[PDB]
């Protein structure tokens, strides 16, 4: 069984393309703690502790495009 369907983000994808063809600063992040793991100076980690930043940002964007806009009636998660 193979079901072909589409997500409910096509208009939001259109808006993202329209409004982010040019660069913009980002200063408000839902989960900022992924960027600041170390609080005491002179401490450093040999492990790739900042590898999660990109996935965190993308996950926040995706889940926000779905969950926050779901408050609009008939919008589907």
């Amino acid at each position: 069984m193979f079901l072909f369907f589409f997500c409910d983000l096509f208009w939001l994808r259109l808006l993202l393309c329209m409004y982010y063809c040019v660069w913009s600063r980002l200063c408000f992040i839902v989960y900022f703690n992924c960027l600041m793991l170390i609080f005491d100076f002179l401490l450093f980690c040999l492990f790739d502790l900042y590898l999660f930043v990109g996935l965190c940002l993308f996950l926040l964007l995706w889940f926000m495009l779905f969950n926050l806009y779901s408050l609009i009636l008939y919008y589907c998660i």
């Binding site: 993202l16 982010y20 660069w23 913009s24 600063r25 980002l26 990109g54 993308f58 964007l61």
Partner: protein, 57 residues
Amino acid sequence: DIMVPSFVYNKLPVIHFLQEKRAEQKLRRVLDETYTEWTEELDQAHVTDAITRSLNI
């Protein structure tokens, strides 16, 4: 298209500020290494004394 561009944009002001300071630091060091150098030359009175001695005076 979206994420990396935004974080590069966020970086620009601090990097610009730090590089301006670095350039000022280079200029300051250039000025600080300059110091008037006064030279000393054999006083002519000793020459005038050797001249007199050579005369057998």
